[PDB]
Amino acid sequence: GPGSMENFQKVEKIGEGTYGVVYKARNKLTGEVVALKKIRLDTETEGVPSTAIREISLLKELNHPNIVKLLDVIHTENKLYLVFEFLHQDLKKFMDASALTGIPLPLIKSYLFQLLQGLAFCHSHRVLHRDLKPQNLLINTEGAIKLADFGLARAFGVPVRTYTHEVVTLWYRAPEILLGCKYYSTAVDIWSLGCIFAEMVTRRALFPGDSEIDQLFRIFRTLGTPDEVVWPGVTSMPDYKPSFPKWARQDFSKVVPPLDEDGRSLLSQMLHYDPNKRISAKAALAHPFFQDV
Amino acid sequence: GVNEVPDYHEDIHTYLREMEVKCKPKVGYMKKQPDITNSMRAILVDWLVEVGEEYKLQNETLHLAVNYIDRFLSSMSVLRGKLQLVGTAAMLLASKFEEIYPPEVAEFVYITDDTYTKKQVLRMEHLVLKVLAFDLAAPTINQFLTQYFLHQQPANCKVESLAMFLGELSLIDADPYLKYLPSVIAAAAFHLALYTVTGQSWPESLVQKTGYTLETLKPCLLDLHQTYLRAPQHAQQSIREKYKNSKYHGVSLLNPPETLNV
Ligand SMILES: COCCn1cc(Br)cn1
Ligand SMILES: COCCn1cc(Br)cn1
Structure with a gap:
């Protein structure tokens, strides 16, 4: 769009990754602080990466206060610069460093309510995030929290076709993916948010598995092993095995003890086994838990 | 559900x-194309149909590529010798957007029967992305x-x-x-x-x-x-x-x- 690196002054490195390096930077004409994510194309024998093509194309369309904004894309034969709205921190760092005796209930509710707005906005625009985890949720000084990192996102059709498997960072990954289901939908993003809701309360991951099978077993031991009653089709799923241990569902008040009745209600609806019964972002915005937000 | x-x-x-x-796309775009015609476009799209079946691409990929092509030719004048290069880059972009497993760039070069270079394919990819302003969804x-x-x-x-x-x-x-x-x-x-x-x-x-x-x-x-x-x-x-x-x-x-x- 209308940008040139000559108008930016780099300030510090703020993060890295396969994508590449991200810098905090300052617009010298307007004063705006931005994050610059550099994607090297000169190092690319396969042209512009598919992650970048998705991130840019999908973010161009998603203008929402709870989705980080793509302000610009600077084109070079050698390089590609994504200019983002800057946010000081991510939820993981806020949890590790400042939330030592906890995140207060008002702030949990506020963040979860904003995450659902952002996610509902994604789903209404036929976009799955597919990597919702605290590291990918950015907070500012004004109390906003915003979905970021759409490198693993995908534009879906209705109904959905088979997409890439084993998506989502394992701790946040929905049982339908772990069971090799042919089709997955908006319900996978809700599962992730459910895991995150719990994590904001306890400051610890809900299901920290070391393998797909360990992940499943941790879930099963928490919510009980699913059967044809709780989840029709489960026993027909490609990576469902009849040998799976059959764990009793523990009372939900034990899963996240400090959580209140409304909290527990909402969390249970986010972590419903059957993707068809799992609550939508849109529906969850009306849940009583948010009454006083 | x-x-x-x-x-x-x-x-x-x-x-x-x-x-x-x-x-x-611009409805009237071909009249303003001095060197290409509906008939040449038809040949290209038909070819892209074959390319999709040879590489077992989704039908969505095919539809996206055609959309990219028509929009590009709405603002950019192309010589008949390069219509295939535009089409190839469109198929690549569409595949990278829509496919779980897109064909590698080299395969895209291969199907053009060594008409174009890997370097040509990638520079057109860049151009199409410029012209479409990454508006690919x-x-x-x-x-x-x-x-x-x-x-x-x-x-x-x-x-x-x-x-x-x-x-x-x-x-x-x-x-x-x-x-x-x-x-x-x-x-x-x-x-x-x-x-x-x-x-x-x-x-x-x-x-x-x-x-x-x-x-x-x-x-x-x-x-x-x-x-x-x-x-x-x-x-x-x-x-x-x-x-x-x-x-x-x-x-x-x-x-x-x-x-x-x-
Ligand atoms: C944790 O701070 C990361 C800074 N940042 C990255 C983007 Br994209 C926007 N802000
Ligand atoms: C020089 O070639 C004529 C234009 N053309 C190429 C294809 Br493929 C379809 N039309």
């Missing part, structure tokens, strides 16, 4: 209806079709595949199909398929959803119906060959209706 996103399908439909208007005929399909009482795979086929046929012929939005062609294609297979007509529930009626679809339908009748005589045949395959229920072998009564 959730695979059909009950809570989002209207939102999504409405949004695609908006976006198909933004992503629309375009609504296709397929995205509409699959939603319309949820209104069959009950589901009929011959209907679905035939509709897909007719939609694909429209990609080949800029005249007249550039003048219709994906959602309207999909409507025409759905009704024609449904009529041909079951005798039934465009459902009222789809009148509720779309606001389209047989009245409003009539122009497109008369063109699609003629395209269907003449399809065995078209110079381009790759879509018909493709739709003989059992994967698509051999629908290209069904007989078009002689009249619509519409």
Whole structure:
């Protein structure tokens, strides 16, 4: 769009990754602080990466206060610069460093309510995030929290076709993916948010598995092993095995003890086994838990 | 259920209806192209149909590529010698967007029969991305079709595949199909398929959803119906060959209706 690196002054490195390096930077004409994510194309024998093509194309369309904004894309034969709205921190760092005796209930509710707005906005625009985890949720000084990192996102059709498997960072990954289901939908993003809701309360991951099978077993031991009653089709799923241990569902008040009745209600609806019964972002915005937000 | 996103399908439909208007090519674009013609475009699209089947690409990929091509040729004048280069870069971009496992760039070079270089393919990819301003999440005929399909009482795979086929046929012929939005062609294609297979007509529930009626679809339908009748005589045949395959229920072998009564 209308940008040139000559108008930016780099300030510090703020993060890295396969994508590449991200810098905090300052617009010298307007004063705006931005994050610059550099994607090297000169190092690319396969042209512009598919992650970048998705991130840019999908973010161009998603203008929402709870989705980080793509302000610009600077084109070079050698390089590609994504200019983002800057946010000081991510939820993981806020949890590790400042939330030592906890995140207060008002702030949990506020963040979860904003995450659902952002996610509902994604789903209404036929976009799955597919990597919702605290590291990918950015907070500012004004109390906003915003979905970021759409490198693993995908534009879906209705109904959905088979997409890439084993998506989502394992701790946040929905049982339908772990069971090799042919089709997955908006319900996978809700599962992730459910895991995150719990994590904001306890400051610890809900299901920290070391393998797909360990992940499943941790879930099963928490919510009980699913059967044809709780989840029709489960026993027909490609990576469902009849040998799976059959764990009793523990009372939900034990899963996240400090959580209140409304909290527990909402969390249970986010972590419903059957993707068809799992609550939508849109529906969850009306849940009583948010009454006083 | 959730695979059909009950809570989002209207939102999504409405949004695609908006976006198909933004992503629309210039209807008159070929007259302003000094060196290329509808006939050359038809050859290209037909070729891209073959490339998709050789590499077992999704039909969505095919529709996206054509969208990229038509938009690009709406603002950029191209010599006949380079039309294939544009098409190749479009297929690459579409594959990287839509495929789980896109073909590697080298395979894209290979299919062009060493007409172009790896370097040429990648620089055009860059150009197409510049011209389209990375605006790649375009609504296709397929995205509409699959939603319309949820209104069959009950589901009929011959209907679905035939509709897909007719939609694909429209990609080949800029005249007249550039003048219709994906959602309207999909409507025409759905009704024609449904009529041909079951005798039934465009459902009222789809009148509720779309606001389209047989009245409003009539122009497109008369063109699609003629395209269907003449399809065995078209110079381009790759879509018909493709739709003989059992994967698509051999629908290209069904007989078009002689009249619509519409
Ligand atoms: C944790 O701070 C990361 C800074 N940042 C990255 C983007 Br994209 C926007 N802001
Ligand atoms: C020089 O070639 C004529 C233009 N053309 C190429 C394809 Br593929 C289709 N049309």
